[PDB]
Structure formats: C-alpha cells, structure tokens
DNA sequence: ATAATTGTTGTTAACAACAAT
DNA sequence: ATAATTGTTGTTAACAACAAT
C-alpha cells in the first residue's frame, strides 16, 4: 500500500518522500526526530496536533496539503524525548484519529542541501504551522558559508 | 475555586452542577457514565474530543457555553469502557488540553427527572453533538409509559 | 434483542428463561451461583468450557440444545468466588467465543419446585455434562420428605 | 526437564528446538511473534486455542505431533500486540489449559532460511492449522527473488 | 432483607523510556 | 559507526475481588 502513500506524497508534495528521510529498518529503534506524511488527515484534527505536539517538541513544521486525488500532510517532529516509530506510531495514530496505515515515519535526512532546503523552502510559506528554531542541520546547510 | 467552577457552571447553565449528577468520594471508583464539566475550553479542541470519543463511547452528548465570564463545556459521556474519575481525569485532560484543576467529573444523576430532563433539553438545540442511541435511564424518565 | 434470546430459549427447552432465574438489575452485583444461556455456541469451546470451568466451579451443569432455527445451551455454574454479571460476562464472551450480545446471565432461581426439576431433570440426562455435588437448594426441594 | 523437552519436541519433529528460535534471556522482553512449544496438550484445547488466537493474531500457524512418547504441539504466533514471555506463559496457559511447565517460548529465529524453511514445509501438511498473510521474512527467504 | 451501590485494594497487560552494545 | 537489538524498569489503564451498608 506504500506505493500509494508514495506516489501521493510526490503528486502532493513534488518529491519522493525518501528524498527528505533517510531509513530506520526497526520499529523500536529509538529516535528525537521525525518526518510524518499523513494521509486523510481531518482539518480539525491537523490544527489540533500542532497546539498538541508543541507541549512536547523542541521543534515542530506542519504542512498540509491536498486536492481531489488525495490529501496528505507532513511534519517534521522534534520530540524533546527519543520515540521508536511504534511509540511515534501510535502515539500519532491516535492524536490525529486515522488508522495506522495513514502514517508514515521515518528519520529525518539529515546531510543533504536538497532535503534541507524542502524544510527550508516550506518554512518560507506563511500556511506552514512553525514552531521553536529552526534544527541546526537545516540551518548550517542553507547559509551563506 | 471549585466554587467559583459551580458558580460559573451555574452562571453558564443555570442550575447546579449538583442537580445533575450523583456522588462518588473516590477517584478510584471506576464507572462507564460520567458528566464533565470542562473550563477554559479551545473551540478547536472542543471540536476534536467530540469526533475522537465517538471511537470509545456508546453514547455521547456535547454541549459548549460562554460569556463575558468564561466558557465552559459539559460531557454526558458513557464510555464503551469503565473509567475511574483518575483515569478519565488524565484522559480528558490531555485530550482536551487543560490542566486537571479545569475539570468537574461525577457521575451522572440517573435516578430523578429534574435531571434526566437536562439532556433532554439540551437534546433540543441543534448547536449539540449527539452520538448513539440515548440512553435508558434519560429516555424512560422522559417518555410516556 | 432479549425478545429472540428468550423466545429462542423456550421453543428451545419448553420453558422461560425466567422460569428458572431470579432478577439482578444491577450488573456490578457479584454472586456465586449463575444460569447461562449462550446463543450461537460452538461445539468445541462447548466442550473446552466445561473442562474450563471445572477448574473454578465447586459445581457445573452444562446442557446444549439445537435444531434449525437457532442453537442455546444452559449454564448452571457455581464460581468458587462470587463474580459480577460483567466478570462472568466478560470472562465466559470469551471462554465461549460469542460476542457478549450472545449471552444471558442471570442468578438462579432457588425457593421454587418448578426449577428444581428443571435442573434435576437435566441431571437425568446423559447428555449433560455435569461435575459436582448436586446443589443443596435443588435437592432439599426434590427429595421425598 | 527442559532437555527432556527439547529431546521430545527433537524425538517428535526432528530439528533442536532451537534451530528455530532466537534467543531471548529475559521474560520481560516483549515481542509480537513468539514460538510455542506445548506439551501433552489436550486434542479439544488444540482445536479451541487456534480458533481463540485468530481474534488477536495476525498470523498463526499451528502443527500437533504425537506418539508412544508423548505429544507436543507447535505454534508460530504474531500477536497483534506486543507480549513478554511472562504474559504468553500466563495467556498460553490458561489457554491450553497446562502448567506454565508445560511451555516452550522463545520468538522464531527470522534469519536464517533453514528455520525460515521448517514453517514453509510444515504450511504443506493439511492437517496444519493456517491463519493470515505468510510473514515477511518467511516470505523472502524461501521464494525466488 | 435481598441486592443495589460504592468504597477500596491487589494484579497485570499494554507501553514508554532508556541502558547497552 | 550508524542503527538494530534486546535487556530492564517505571507507570497506568483494565479488572477481579471483596468490605460495607
């Protein structure tokens, strides 16, 4: 069913979701921060989540978007605590009320420009939900050197 | 301040807390029905609870009040499971987002039709969140037989 | 959907549920001694339940009856510990395998000749599977004084 | 004892018991997929317990062994939750209906195409006992890719 | 006076969290 | 050397059990 969850998340988003996440084989390996595409996400719920998460994240970007084909929404997550994917997973599941099969977690990729400037470019859009500083690895890798 | 919540809830609703629901001196003591009385309560967050509970309620029934005074919101929840007022204290507190001091739980006031009538008044403007067949207890006190 | 149980219950052993039971209003209620009627029952947790019980009953009568339109079995347990509607409920929707809708728990009904012969009766049977001293109150009232 | 096992279930299936399971020295440890080895397992509680696990397996496969020496039963189990082997024992044993004595847990050995292989050919009897998708890792392992 | 009703207290599955390689 | 992997240990919902009227 991934091939779905991808294939929407690039008409969505103009980019495969591996170009922004690099991979995490277990589902209890621990980790503070996360990328989440959710699929079928409710308005009330998106909006809800952000207020949520900031209680417990040192650094949070929501972004949604959506069409007729489909709707999908990305975040990525900085949990003040390290979270497995379960942890992340159900956590989430919950908070945002769509099955598990509507998520998608993965860490984050961390060295590479063309992923930063994703995070970069989608904090430039104001409907973009931002909240703490801007992660160091994003920063250090679109500035002026 | 549990007394200026009463008053409040009072000043709100216009009839005690008291006179809709029934004692229970121990928050260890579980239950399936409870009556909340929620204080300081995010319109969005109000929205949410309501489709999220649905998930793990028989019957559920949400009705939102304020001024320039205060807002406060009352549950008349009947979860699928028992619940102590410990447990539904964290439950809703986190998923309502508000500390623990802006919540009134007990029981709800099954046995007397002063009572049984609240709900049913409140089941009369369309402004309410009704979820699942209405209760025994509130349809029998309240029907001709 | 009682209507079904119960009428089932009597095209099924020619005679009322109530016939044989005593009413409990209240679920929370712990006894030790109850009737069971299961609807729907396979004959494989049929016969594990029996071996099960036993374990836990200082006395058991299991009886099975079918035909076209629907198939019912009789309890007769008696839990070394007094248990809830909701314990034995929960404990034999399981045990069984029928969701709880499946089941009809009520206390037996003891000052009363018509069930006494009901469940000695039964005892005559070979069919029954049966474990323990026949119960006091059931011999006491089918004994020739 | 535990030799006279692993002897028996060798006597009964011809392979080490360990050849199939990977080690886990803490009955703490929590996992979704464990393997069972249960011994003088009752005909009817085999029936039962693989009718009963289906309600919370997402894939379960099941073979029974027995002769002049004893019996032993196998079970390949994916909970849908996760469960220490503390919480099997107890679940299993109540279950099948034995003293906690009577079981082997340990979770399968996924690596390792020999062992990945003892499941494919046991999926080849029909007097096997076959619930959900065949699990990845013994998908991989023993087809052409 | 049977039960209806809460107290009141253990036990334990379902987990998060984190040490440790 | 990143993670994959179990240890290992709290916390707490979901309950049984039973005191007490």
């Not at 779905?4 to 980790?31: E, W």
């Not at 996360?34 to 417990?56: D, P, T």
């Not at 159900?90 to 400037?117: D, F, H, T, Y």
């Amino acid at each position: 069913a991934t091939v779905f969850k991808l294939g929407l998340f690039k008409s969505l988003f103009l980019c495969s979701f591996h170009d922004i996440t690099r991979l995490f084989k277990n589902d209890k390996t621990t980790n503070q921060q996360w990328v989440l595409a959710v699929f079928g996400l409710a308005e009330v719920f998106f909006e809800a989540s952000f207020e949520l998460l900031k209680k417990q994240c040192s650094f949070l970007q929501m972004q949604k978007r959506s069409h007729e084909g489909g709707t999908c929404a990305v975040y990525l997550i900085c949990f003040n605590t390290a979270k497995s994917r379960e942890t992340v997973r159900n956590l989430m599941a919950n908070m945002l009320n769509v099955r598990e099969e509507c998520l998608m977690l993965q860490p984050p990729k961390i060295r590479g420009l063309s992923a930063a400037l994703f995070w970069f470019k989608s904090s430039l859009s104001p409907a973009t939900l931002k909240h703490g500083a801007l992660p160091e690895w994003i920063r250090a890798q679109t500035t002026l050197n």
